[model samples]
Target: IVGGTASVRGEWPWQVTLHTTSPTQRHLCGGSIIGNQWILTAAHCFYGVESPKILRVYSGILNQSEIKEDTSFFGVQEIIIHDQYKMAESGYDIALLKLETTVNYTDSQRPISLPSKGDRNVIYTDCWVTGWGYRKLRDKIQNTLQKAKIPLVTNEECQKRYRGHKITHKMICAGYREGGKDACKGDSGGPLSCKHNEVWHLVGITSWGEGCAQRERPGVYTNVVEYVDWILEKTQ
Candidate 1:
């Protein structure tokens, strides 16, 4: 995450690091544990990828250089992308990964709860985005997970700023008008969580943006609430 600070260990236990192998294992994107065997991420993360066999999910990862004793790795059993998803625009930019084995729940590994049907449309003013993505535009990726607190931007304001671009109902915007904080490259597919009534709800999936922490162009995310039914249908 650009302009973000290092996150404390186990602060985001549901966070997962996604890897792909072109020739060697390399971190590709970030994801969140939605269930013992299900992960939620952006569809674009697997764009042009042929098979799930080349993918792996690592949970309870705070630092990329050092793997903790409690960290767990899982093989991807299946990849389920939304039927409406396409590379043309950023709407419906969500997907789910089915792990071959169930995750062992622990203090450093757990699943994040989804919003109830009633809370789906509730807009959260305060939220946090976490990932081990780049610290700057064209800079090296961070080894340690980074987090940033950003306020949710209204869809009307976001759409007005990025006039020509399509900002659909399936998407939500978050960041400061002054910029300085946002999810950047390699952060795509990560979670944007908001605390509501003592429980944190996975509000958004890091989707796209104009540039890393650029002014007027806030980060766009896939509105997780809008697709609760779709997620439940696929997971069930």
Candidate 2:
């Protein structure tokens, strides 16, 4: 979340951190609490991973170093990646993590509502992307969960900007056309939520970007509207 501010407690409650067992990776992917027992994230986060035993989820924390004893932290039981998801830029860059234990909903830990089927008809404004992004692309230190107010980009326009990469219907682009703020490294699988009728709906999944807040580039997100049924089916 380049060019963003530290999020307040209870804000963006659905945001979750996926901890990895890798020794080299400092920060892993981010996720959203879709259910008490299920978390939504990018499939590429689990690429080449052999087991879920080493993975743990930490939720409801705005500042990672200031976490309390009662924070929502749990181990993962299983990971379900989309069958077609092959790489980071691939279309279906989404996955679900089943928690070993269910989470108790609190003010700072809650599940975000998935947009209804009809919500897709509206082009959403007042959208945002949240994550604990690196201070800079080369910096490995962790920072507070930051939130940036970015507008949605039409698929046609997004397709034009990411000329080197393929933009499909399954992806939604967001950020500034001139590039002031955008998602950076370590923010993958974070939420790109939009408000509709006063309710914050999960609109996109932070997937990839060319660089940190670079000009002429926007953040690519997994379009949640395209996977509502699939999410429901897998959770059921």
Candidate 3:
């Protein structure tokens, strides 16, 4: 994440790194564990992939350089991209992956709750985004996870930043006007979570923007709240 602080182990437990299954095991994107076997991410994360069976997921690992023997790992059994999600530039950027094995819950490894239907219109604060994305523009991906507290931007105001681009209801924008904080390239499919009454809700998924932390161009996220029913229907 750009202009963010390094995150501790237990701080963002639901966050997971999406990786390629090739010999090099490249880190591709960020994801969130919504169920024991379900990983929520962006559709673009799987772009150009021929088979989903080879995709791997690594959890309970905070440092990119470290993959402990006991790190929770799983191969993807299936990938479900939103049927309407045709491209990255438009909305419906979300997708779900079914893990070959279920995750064993622990204090520092578990799932997060999804926002309720009423939360779509509710004002949110104390929100944060976490990822192993780039630290700055065109920089290398960081070894440690990072997080930043971000303010929510309405679709109406967010459109002013990308006048040529469409800001549909399926999208949510968050960042500072001066643009010192945001999720970057490798952060796509990461969670934009918000805390309410001690429970953090998966409010958004890092999707797109003009650039990382650019003035007036806050990060665009897939409005998770808008797809609550879709997620449930797809996963159920």
List, residue by residue over 1-236, the lDDT tens digit for candidate 1. 97899998999999999988666777899999999999999999997577999887888788887744354569999999999888725588999999999998999888888877777567686699999898888887689999999999988999998887888888889988888999999999999998887788899999988888999899999989889999999999
For candidate 1, which ten residues in a row score worst on lDDT? 64-73
TM-scores of the candidates are: 0.95, 0.94, 0.96
Evaluate all candidate structures by whole-model CA lDDT and list the values in order. Answer: 0.88, 0.85, 0.88
1 versus 2: better lDDT goes to:
1
The best candidate in terms of TM-score: 3
Clashing pairs in 3: none
lDDT of 3 by residue, 106-157 (tens): 9877899999766666788889999989878779888999999999988899
On lDDT, the stronger of 2 and 3 is: 3
Per-residue lDDT, model 2, residue 114, is 95
Clashing pairs in 1: none
lDDT of 2 by residue, 1-236 (tens): 78878888888899998877565334588899999999999998887577897787988777777644454469899899998998888689999999999899989789989988776688898899988876467865366888899999888988888887889999999978778788878788889989988998999999988887887788899999899999999999
Each model's Cα RMSD: 1.8, 1.9, 1.4
